[PDB]
Amino acid sequence: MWVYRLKGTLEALDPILPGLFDGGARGLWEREGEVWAFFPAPVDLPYEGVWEEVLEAWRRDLKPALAPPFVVLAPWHTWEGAEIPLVIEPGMAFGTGHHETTRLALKALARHLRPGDKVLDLGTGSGVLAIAAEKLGGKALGVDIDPMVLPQAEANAKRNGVRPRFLEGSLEAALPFGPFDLLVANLYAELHAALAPRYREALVPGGRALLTGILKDRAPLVREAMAGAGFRPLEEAAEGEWVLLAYGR
Amino acid sequence: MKKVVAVVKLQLPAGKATPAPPVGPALGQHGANIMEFVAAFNAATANMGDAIVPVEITIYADRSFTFVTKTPPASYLIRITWEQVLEIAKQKMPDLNTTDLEAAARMIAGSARSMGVE
Ligand SMILES: Nc1ncnc2c1ncn2[C@@H]1O[C@H](C[C@@H](N)CC[C@H](N)C(=O)O)[C@@H](O)[C@H]1O
Fold first, then answer.
1. CATH class of domain segment(s) B1-70
2. DSSP 3-state assignment of A237?
3. What's the gap between Cα A42 and its chain centre?
4. What keywords sit in the KW lines (chain B)?
């Protein structure tokens, strides 16, 4: 990781800032009296500054995360309780199992999923929800638009002795493998709202959708879109800033 | 309250923040939950697409945090001077320090000229 240092505040260097992101900066940081631009690789900039060639506390303090009936474990953990173990290798791919949204979806799966149900996990990442679905007797497809998480999802699956299907893409790619009994989607409010009509098309008549990744204040958008798509509200769950909204068609 | 121990000013791409620098060290030095911020920032700025988002993270003595996202900057909103500041002046209300709804366009259009935009 590289850093390009510039004297002054962020507001003071305002006009030249878009040029720093044109170079390929990943983030700016105002400090004592400087602005710290961060680059993957150093490239010459005529702004005149100084280049410098300069998570594990979280990872080594990482404890098992309870999401009844599950416990989310790193490969280096064990568990003596009665909970269903979910072994997830912590990485850069979302789905470590610790976040509120992931845990809300895990619990919602336990309440809604029937053994034999066809389950679509939209935005599978690490594969945690598709794996959990399989653990509950579901027949899971996990899809992701990022092909890089897919090897990680398959590796996680083998750690758990289950075999969901994993696939690159989104709702479109999932279509030939559906229709589904249950959709689980840990995304974000505005995407749920845009996808609501296609959520209905993805499910069998009487099927259901479990939607999370939704900031509390953004929930009205999802409620409005899902009602507009013809869904009926089933239940809502919350933890901290976040909510899960369950719907039936 | 909740004692404030830091006010961190960052500028991040919308919905694509990571635990990598500056977020890592910026919040990590005060013991704030990096992964919690990353997840929350990304969801809060998700619909904005590729917009550069300035963010202010207030970190407290119990290691918890809150944050505020910005308008964002005019230099991004500038990138041929048309009727730009008929809505940009109303966009720069919660960013500029001037305590007037109207007296803003008389400074944004001038700042746009040197970029250089004609
Ligand atoms: N339109 C989309 N279609 C499919 N996947 C998406 C889409 N947008 C984002 N994603 C993926 O969804 C994932 C979102 C994760 N936060 C969810 C991870 C995991 N399912 C969990 O509940 O923890 C990311 O890995 C994205 O790559």
1. alpha beta
2. strand
3. 31
4. Methylation, Ribonucleoprotein, Ribosomal protein, RNA-binding, rRNA-binding
Q: Confirm or deny that A102 is annotated as ligand binding.
A: yes
| Contact across the interface for B23 and A96, Cβ inside 8 Å | no
Q: How would DSSP label each residue in A20-86?
A: HHHHT--BEEB-SSEEEEEESS----TT--EEE---HHHHHS---EEETTEEEE-TT----SSSEEE
What residues in A contact B42, CB-CB < 8 Å? 188
Structure letter (DSSP) for residue A115 = T
Question: Within 6 Å (CB) of ligand 1, which residues are found?
Answer: A 94-95, 102, 105, 122-125, 128-129, 143-146, 149, 170, 186-187
Give B63-70 contacts, CB < 8 A, sequence gap 24+: B63/B30, B63/B31, B63/B32, B63/B33, B64/B2, B64/B32, B65/B27, B65/B32, B65/B33, B65/B36, B65/B37, B67/B37, B67/B40, B67/B41, B69/B41, B69/B44, B69/B45, B70/B94, B70/B95
3-class DSSP state of A249: coil
B42 residue type, one letter: N
Q: A91: domain range?
A: 56-248
Resolution in Å equals: 2.0
B20/A38 Cβ within 8 A: yes
Experimental technique behind these coordinates: X-ray
Residues A77 and A35 occupy one common structural domain: no
Helix and strand element counts for chain A (H, E): 8, 14
Residue with the smallest CA separation from ligand 1 atom 20 is A124
Q: Indicate whether A147 and A157 sit together in one domain.
A: yes
Look at A99 and B39 and tell me if their CB atoms are within 8 Å.
Answer: yes
Residue A41 neighbours by CB distance under 10 Å: 8
CATH class of B71-118: mainly alpha
Q: Whole-angstrom Cα distance, residue A147 to residue A208?
A: 27
